[PDB]
Each structure stands twice: as structure tokens, then as C-alpha cells.
Amino acid sequence: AEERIEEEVSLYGPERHVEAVFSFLTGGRISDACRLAQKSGDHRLSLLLSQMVGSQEMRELISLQLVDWNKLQVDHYIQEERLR
Amino acid sequence: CNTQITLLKKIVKRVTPGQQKFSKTASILWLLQQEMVTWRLIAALYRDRIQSALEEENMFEIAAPNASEKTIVDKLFQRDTLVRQSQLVVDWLESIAKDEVGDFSDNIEYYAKSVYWENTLHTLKQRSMLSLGSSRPLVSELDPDAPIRQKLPLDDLDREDDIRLLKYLFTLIRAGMTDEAQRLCKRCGQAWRAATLEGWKLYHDANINGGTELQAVEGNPYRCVWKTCCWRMAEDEQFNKYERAIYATLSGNLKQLLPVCESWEDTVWAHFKVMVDSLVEQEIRASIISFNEANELPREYLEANWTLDSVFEELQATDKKRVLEENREHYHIIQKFVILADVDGLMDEFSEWLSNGKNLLLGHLLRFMTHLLLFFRTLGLQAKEEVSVEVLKTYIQRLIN
Amino acid sequence: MVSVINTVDTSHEDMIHDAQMDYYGIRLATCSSDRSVKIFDVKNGGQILIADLRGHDGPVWQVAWAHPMYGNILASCSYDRKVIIWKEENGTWEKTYEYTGHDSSVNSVCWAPHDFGLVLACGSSDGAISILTFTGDGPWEVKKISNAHTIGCNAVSWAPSVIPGSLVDQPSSQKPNYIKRFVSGGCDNLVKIWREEDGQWKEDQKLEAHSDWVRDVAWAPSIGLPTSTIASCSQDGRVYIWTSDDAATNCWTPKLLHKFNDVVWHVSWSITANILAVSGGDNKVTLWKESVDGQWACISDVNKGQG
Amino acid sequence: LTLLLDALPLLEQKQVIFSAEQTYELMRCLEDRMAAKLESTSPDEIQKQDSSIDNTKVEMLRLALARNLARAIVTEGALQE
Amino acid sequence: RTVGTRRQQELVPLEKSVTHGRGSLLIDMGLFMGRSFR
Amino acid sequence: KLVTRHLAADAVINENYRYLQSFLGELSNPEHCKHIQDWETAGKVYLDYIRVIDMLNLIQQDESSGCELEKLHTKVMSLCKWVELIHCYTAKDRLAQSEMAKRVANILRVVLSLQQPPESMSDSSEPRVPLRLLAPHIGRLPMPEDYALEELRGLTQSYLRELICDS
Amino acid sequence: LLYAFHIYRHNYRKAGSVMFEYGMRLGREVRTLRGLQKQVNSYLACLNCLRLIRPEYAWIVQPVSGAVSSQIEILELRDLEKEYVLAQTRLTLAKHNPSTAAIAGSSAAEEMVALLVQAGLFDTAISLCQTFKLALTSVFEGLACKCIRLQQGGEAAQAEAWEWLAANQLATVITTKESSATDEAWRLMISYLDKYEAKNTLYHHCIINKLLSHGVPLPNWLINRYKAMDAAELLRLYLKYDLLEEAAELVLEYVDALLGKGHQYFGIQATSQLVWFPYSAIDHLRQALGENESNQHNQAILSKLQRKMDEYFQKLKKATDDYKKLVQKPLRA
């Protein structure tokens, strides 16, 4: 993936956390995926992506939080694919 | 002591604020609390000293290609106890802060919950209707970093609730109750923040040495990256002072922790907490053979030396008036010399206090001094004596009078 | 009354709404409907415009000098809903901060006693009061009291810095937990006293005696007496002196100073003599002093034109 | 800018046709360019992913001008005997 | 030219009652009350 | 605070150590040292700069007694590893830092001039001995990447020459 | 060779120091035309090497060349910028003008600004303002003088003016057969005032103050744009030019703007909240209309305006009383 991902990272110009963030994840290398979160105050994944993570429950509660925003029927004005 | 403290607390709470008659009560109630915290301290430290002296004996495993920190620390505990005493001072100071929290942990549940709500959401829906004049620019997204990334504020109520939550999370962490802080984050709907408080867990894979049953991997293998992120978050002034202090506590950033420490106990705790983190990570790194890097801190960070004395020298150099006032209180002087293991210096302070006026010493302090000397004598640690006899004589004459 | 001193041609193009001398009395700040804040260095006579500070989009209502321990800092507030903080560095005046957190005209600004830090109170026609705090590190912190007055806040004045129990023995090195208070006057006819408790501002008292909009409020400086004194003036032409003899009772008693035939615009205390200056819609400035029997007497009437 | 880049390759050559006092005048022109940019010249086009290259082009020009000047002084001084 | 008109710099003599009923309107009083001196 | 951020840089440019030597001498008392934030750091720093200069000159002349020379060596070898850490958080901070490094280096050169014993008896005082600590201190020494690293490169060239001599 | 040797060793610090020394000594001993242009080439090269530096630690220690106890001064680009901006203003002054060429030779920044203003180089004056911190007041005055050259100018002077107008950035000299070398010169002045945004009426002040020197009748929309910003300053300017009519039309339009008609052409923003009434300016208008009053036209306009203001204040009073009734419903939730 490493060749076609640096083609992609040359094209997705400043910026999109609902696209170039996705392509960096489809071939990890999370080391540099953190320096790229510079533009977000969200290195939540700065240590999460590099590590194995809590798995079973940590990210499952991220999931539950999502389920809950969903049920809340609130936060309708949210990023189109930030949900993806 | 706790039985009488509980009685006196009930008496002081029933008194209308402004009766000068109960001031003697408040002052010696504080003295009684210090005395209770002194018997607990004696029990903790002398139990360790006696147990250590009985096991000042066997050993011994050295090194492995591996570097599971758990294994490095388990091997340290065998041969080094100097670092341990600093963690006992941290655990002691975290226990004091826990006693101050009391049942307030249960009362936090009334203020930090789920709601019938509106909110930034109502203002965003109303702006979609008409272009209302004099409208403050609020965040457009509800992800946790949106306020910082967009440089836009939350609604003033939500911002106040976040500041209040962060203050409570810091109080729970200062009390050693990191699991209650994580439960509070999950209950408030901030399960993401609960996960950020777990990144300090030591990496351990019990399967590396070939067990009969597969055990679950523990801790965070990306600790160095997580710690570097926590350090950057502590230095960023866009974050609230308590959020900075939470991540400062968790990453060893003393400079960003000190601004929220208001008492002597908070200041001592900040120094000892960062000292233990610093020494632990220096040992983990010295155990390393190769690998990449979460940090390259200036050389001033690596040549820094942490000692019991240097902590109390920095406390004397503080600009905080309250800490400088509390640092002159007889019990904090005793606690300093007990931490330093300097019995001879403690006996000089006792000689000075007896010389500056025998009648100015409070009766409970003279009791504490007497029983502390009897405790040291039981350890064959009498530590000078003409003076010990003259303190006892002066206290006996006071009890007679 | 007093011997004639220098005349300053300010080169203005409109009415100066308000004027304040700096702490050492070497500088005069002035502000006008012309949207400027002008600074004059009138040392030993010699009128001298040293700055024309432009940054407001509407009439400037009030100016306030900070304590000189923070350097040469001036606050201004305006009809444009902004508060601007001006600072002099190396003889150059610059806008160092701008606060835009009010929805209507900001009518009054007052610096806290320097013992509390660099703190500014701001009263607005939106009915809110904002407390701006500078800690030395980072941006200004803002504590906003929403709905402080029902219609609008016209005036704010800080209480003097009083150490609780200053006659009680204390350690050589200690921190004096000051009771931070200020008074506000509003278009709801109320004079309100505020207190900081646990880092939040609460309404401590409501003072009810005016029958129309409170125009100005001035907390008397502490002359080392236990009695706290506030002056207020109103659209109803009354001036009240509010006294509290015991800080523990929080009991404020109104005394009518005088009733003018026209609006009273501003009230200001003399630092050393407990003399009240009162400015009326009759274009007069009257000076008042309490006599030994507790009566208030007019000691001077200053008309526009006797200089 | 385009013309200054052309001049850069030209000076680059092992032998430079341009005189030392000629491209010192070119340096003057470049400084004037920078000054006008900072102000009058369209700020939008000034902000391009090119500044690094430009600075590298300017350093190459300074080196070529200094090397030509040192050679020119030696040859002109050797013809004055 | 180089002469001037001649700026009338009076804080106006004594027009009053007009602007006064005008302000009797209680809808706004902060402008009514710009005229005098704090 | 104040002294450091201003008077020290100007007194080094003008080299007015005396006027600075009172305030820092009076702050260096064993009871005042207990209470000064950053005391350790800056106290040591400036006090030492001035002291080193003075001691050096005077002793050298005097008769260059050995023991003070041991204690000057001890102070100087540690001071390498303290000039390493200056946190000049602001501009002038860095301005002054540079200024001082420069002047100190000049003075040190001149002083070493007649330093470790001119070898009249040896074939001209060849510096065969090489100190690893000086090289380690230079690596941890912090200053601008231009002039400071150029000086480091010169030191590295000297070390290479010493290695060639050892060969 | 000193200079070339320093340049070969990438010693930009040393190169700058040596070129500075060169220019000092140059001027010192060589007060001829040629040796003085060498002073110049040397300062030019100093600045040039110094500024062709490195990056993260691009910062190079700079010591004042106390040799034409020596103090050490750190410049950065900034202060030697000041110095050669001064040098080049002298240079152009001497190119454009010969006698002040000599006085530039012995002249300073402000002096060069003055010389440029005299030779008629408005663009040169603007460049001097950008270099020396004397603002664009002088530059605005020069552009304004060029604008005047259009209002009260002559054939031969109009023919010569196209040369200096073309030498300044009018990126849009549309030579329409209607816009003469005078219209394009005034467009260049406007574009230079725009290219220098400032938070003050300074540029409109300097243009108006320049026009009113002999009087002027600046274009409907330009006046409308000024009103969209500066209703007062116009009125003060009108008083200076003593035009009674235009002042009354401006007040009628400003009152219509406050009432909701064309408010966008008057910088006016208007459940009632705030309504600033410019009572002091209206009272000055009443005084100014009262100090003369011979004309029967200004009095007819004044009476029409007063009647309309009374209608407005009566409706404002009603709307304010109805808002007070609306705000009183509900403290019964």
C-alpha cells in the first residue's frame, strides 16, 4: 500500500479529516498520522493508533458513545463521513 | 482519635458561624486531625521498616533480552527501596486528599449528569432560520477537539460544566482515585477521556515466557507516544488549567502541574509524583536496546538529579505565600524530617522549640513529640537524651499543674 | 474656589464624556463621542497631547487607568459594545486586548484594587457585567454575570481592598484572602452589591431607594474606618449615601444627600477627605462633605464659566 | 521571477558571460522585487510553494557572483602590470 | 484661499425641551445621557 | 527575575561584573539560596562566570597555586554542563545568551593560553592528553546551530588531530 | 580579496561586517561621485550577504564595527534595512534631481522624502514612508497633489503628467478618450491608498484636505462610500468648505438611513435594542443654521427636517411604550 498511499497523500491537499485521514488509516504508518492530526487537537488517536489499544472495551465505549449521539437524535449537523 | 474528631466535627457543624467561643475548637480540631494523620504515618513507615529489616536478605535475577516494564520493576523492587519511599509519600499524600474528598464523591453525582438539554444545538438551529445579529461564533462540530481545532468556544453553560468536570477529575486523580475519575468520565458521556486516563498502564505480555494458559496482554505498548501527547496537551494554553494539570500529572510535567497546587500537601505531592514518574521512566529507558522514539528532550532533562532534599529546597524557593506559611508549621517540619530520615535534625528543631518558650508549645504537640521519642526508643532510635529527659520532665510538670 | 491652574486645549471635535487622571497625576485620559481616547501628559503645566487612541466604532463612555505596578495601562468602553485595553511600551501606545463579549453598549469600566491582581469590571446595556482577569500568562480570562440588571447596567465601582481581621496576629509570610466586592447601578433602579465566592460572582445585596435609572455608583475609598460607604445618583435627581457600619451584618442604610431639579450624571469620592463630587444636568458640579453631626453640607458650587 | 531563474542557470555555467557588476545590479533588482512584494505586488501570488527554491536560487547567484568577482579582480589586477 | 470658516465650538447654549420630550420617549436613555459629564 | 533578564546581558556586554556581584553575592548567602526559585541555576551561572574570570587572572599571575587551580578546574568542568542548559525563553534572552557564550569562549581561550604549564622541558607542550568530558559537555552544550556547531566542528577536527597523533 | 575570501568561506556574518566597514571608511576618506557609489555598492553587498543566510539558527551574532571599549549592537535585517532604504532614497533623489543629489549625498531618510515630494515623485515618497516609519501621510499628500493636478491643470503639464503616472502602479491605465493623463494619475493615487490599508480616516482626510485647498466636487458614489463610513468627518469637511446645502442633503439622507432607507450607504445597522441619535451633531447643525439664516431655502429645509424628526420621535415613543408592554409579558412562566 505504501507507494499508492504517498501518491494519495500528494493529492489530498489541505485538507480533509473525512478522506486523507481515511487513506492514512487504510495503510496505517500511524507514526506520521499523528503529526498530521496537528490540525485538530485530536491525538486521541495519537497514542490509540500506534498502540494495540483497549480493544474489547475502550474503543467499544467509543462505539457506545456513538450509539448514544445517534439515539440522542441530536448533533444532526455533523461531518458527513466523520461517522464512517 | 477518629471517634473524638467525629464528635468535635458534629459540634463545630452545629455552631452558628461567628461565635469566637469555638475558635479554640477549630484550631485544636486541626491539631487532632494532624495527630491522627501522624499515627497513620507511623504505622505505614515503621511497618515497612520492620518488614524490610526482616527481609534484608535473599535474591536474585538479573536482565533478559526482554524489557517488559513489569519485569524490570519487579526486578528493581528486589534491589532498590530508595525510589519506593517516594511512592509511599505519594500514596500517603493521595490518602490525605481522599480523606478530604470523603462522601463528596457520591454528591458529585447530583451535579455532573444526563439532561432534558437545548443547547449550542438550539442556537445553531435558530441561526439556520434567520441571520440573527450580534451572534457569538460557536464551534460547528461536537468532536472532543473541536474547540481547540476551530479556536471557537462552546456555549457558556457547557464550558462551565466542562471546567467543573475537569476540576473534579483532577481532585479524584490527586486522591489516587483514577478508576473513579474514569467511571465519572464514562457517566458524563466522555468515555473518550476515560480512555486517555489509561495510557499510563505498564506494558506486560505474560505469554512471552511460555505459560500453559493464554493470558490477556496488559498496559499500553505505545506509552511513549501517549506520554508525549499528554506533555504537549499540558503545555497548550488553549486547554483549561485542570485539563493541563491532569495530563501534567500523568506525563511527569511538574511546571504545568504546579499552577493548580495551592497547599503544602499539593506542592509536595506534585514534586514526589513527578520524581517517581521520572525515575521509573529513566529505568524503563535504560532497560531498552533499540526501537524508535516518542521523545528527544533537551539535555537539561536528562542531567537533572532528583533527591529528597532537592524537593524541600524547591518548596523553600516557592513564590506561594500559603505554602511558605504552612512549611513553618511544626507538623510539616516533622513530616519533612521523617521523609528525609534525619532524626538528628528533627532533634535540633525540638531543642530550638523548647528554647524559644516551653509555655508556647501546645499540649498535643508535646504529647506527639513525647510518643514519637518513645517510638524511636522502641527502635533503639532514642537519638540524644539529656534533652529527651528534660522535655519529659517539663511535660510531666505541665500535667501536674 | 481653588486658584486657577493650566488650561489644556484638547483639540477635540465633540463633548468629552469622561476624564481621568493617572495614578501619579502626570497624565490625563479623555474620551468622547468622536470615538477617540486622548492622552495628555500635563506635567508642571504644559498641555501636551501624547496619544490619539482610535479603535472604537462608536462614542467612548468611560476610561479607567490601571495601577502603575502593571505599567501604563488604560481601559476604555464604548457604544460599539467593546472594551479596549491600551498599553504603553517604550512611549508607544498599542491595543493589547479587545473584549467583544457584550451584546449592547458598555457603559462603565472600573479596575479592581491592585491587591486582587489586574482585574477589570465592565457594565453593559445588555444587563450583564463582565470581569476580565489577567494572570500574566496567556489570554485574559472572563467571568460574565448574565442578567445582573433587568434592563441595563450603567455603572460599576470596586470596593476598597480590606484584609479580613487586619488587627489579628498573622505569620510574616502569608496570603491575605481578600473579600472581593464591587457595586453596580442599573436601569432597574437598583444598586446591587456583588461578592466573589468560590471563584463565582454572586449578588450579595439589593439596595432599593431610587425611583428611576441609577446613573452612577461610587464606593468610597477606605480611610481606615470600619464603615463602608457608597454613593449613588439617578435620573430621579436624588443622590443617596449608603452606609454599612458592620461588614458582618451586611446592613446598608440609605441617607438622602440631596434632590436636584435635574438628572445627576456622575458621583466621585475624594481619596483623602471623604468629599463627594456630584455632577448634575444643571451644568454644575457640587462638592459635599459630612459634618461631625453626620449632616452632609455643600462646601462648593462650581459653575461652567468661572475660570 | 521567471527571468531571474533563467539568469541563475546562465551564471551557473563553468564560464559566466554576465559581468560581476551586471548581476550585482540583478541583485539590486531582486531586492527591489522583494520590497515591492512585501507591499504592492499581489500578496496572493507571492504566497506560493516556491520560496525555498527562490532562496536556493539566490544563494547560487551570490556564490557565482562572489567567484566571478574574485576571478575578475585577479585578472584585472594582473593586466594592470 | 487659506482663511477658514470659523468653528462654533460652544457646547450649545440652551436648546432643551425638544430633545427632552424626544427622550420622554423611555425607549432609549443612554444617548440622552451622553450630553453631560461623568 | 529582573536582574537576569536585563542587567546581566548589558553588564557582560560592558562586562560590569562588580555592580552585578553585590546582588548575586547577597542572594548567594546559605539562607537566601534555600528560598530562590531558579536560584541554583542562575546563581551558579553568573556567579561562576565572574568568579572564573577573576580567579583565573589573579591566580595565574600571583604564582598560579595548584589547589585553587584544582577548584577552578572543578568549577569550569561542571560549568560546561551548566552553560549547556540555558533556557533563554525570549529574544533578548537568546541575544544575551549568544553574547555571553561568545565573550566567555574568548576569555577562556586567552586564559588557557598560559594554562596547563608551558612545557619548556618538553618538545613544545604538545596536547597529547584528550578529555572525553569536554567533548561530552560540548555535545550537551546548547546554542545556535550556526556559530556554536562551527566551534564544535573545530573541536572535532582538533580531536581527530589528537587521534592521528595517538596512531 | 578580503571581501571575496570571506564570501568563499560562506562567512556571511564576516562578509556583512566587512562590507559595513568598507562603506564606513569609504564615505569617510572618498567624497567624490565614484567613491561614494562604491560606498553604496559596499553597503548593498553587506546587506545582501547578511540576508542570504541559513535557517533554523539563521540567526548570526552581529557586532557593531566600532572601528571606522566598543559596544556591541544586534541589528537583525530591520535596522540595516533602515540604513540602505535611506541610502537608496538618496540614490534616486540624486538620479531624479541634481542639487538635492548633492544634498542627499549629505541627506537623511526624511530629507529624501522631502526631496521626492519636491521633484513630484509621489511613488518615491510612498516608498520612503514604507521604509522609514513616517506613515503614508506624505504619500497620501503626494497622490492627492497628483489628483489636484487633474482639477486645476494645463495642457503642457497634462502631457508631462502621463510620464510620471505611467512610472507608478496604475495596473489599469484605461486610456479611455475621456480619462486624460489626469484621470489615470488620480486612479493611481486611489490604488496606492487602497494598497495601504490603515484603521483611520487618514487617507480620506488627506485627499479631502488636499481638494479643499482650492475647493473640489468629488463624484456622487465616492461621497456615498465616504458616508457609508464617515458621516461626521464629511460634515466637519462641509463646514470647513462652508457648503450649507450638501450638509442638509447629507443630514436628510443620514436620517432616512437611520429610519431604514438606504442604511447600507451610511454604516447603520438599524424587539428594539439600540439606536444611537447623533444629538451633538444635530445641535451643531441647529447652531450653524442659526448663526446665518438669511437664505429662505435653508430655513424651509430646516423646518421640513424638524417636522419629520418630530414625527419620528412621536412614533419612536409609541414603539418604545409598546416594547415596554411586550417585555412585561411574561414573568408568568
Swiss-Prot record, chain D:
In which compartments does the protein localize? Nucleus, Nuclear pore complex; Nucleus membrane
At the top level of its lineage, which domain of life is listed?
Eukaryota
User: Self-association or partners: how does it assemble?
Assistant: Component of the nuclear pore complex (NPC).
* Role according to the record: Component of the nuclear pore complex (NPC) that seems to be required for NPC assembly and maintenance. Involved in nephrogenesis.
The text of the family note is:
Belongs to the nucleoporin Nup85 family.
Q: What is this protein called?
A: Nuclear pore complex protein Nup85
- Positions spanned in the full protein: 573 to 653 of 653
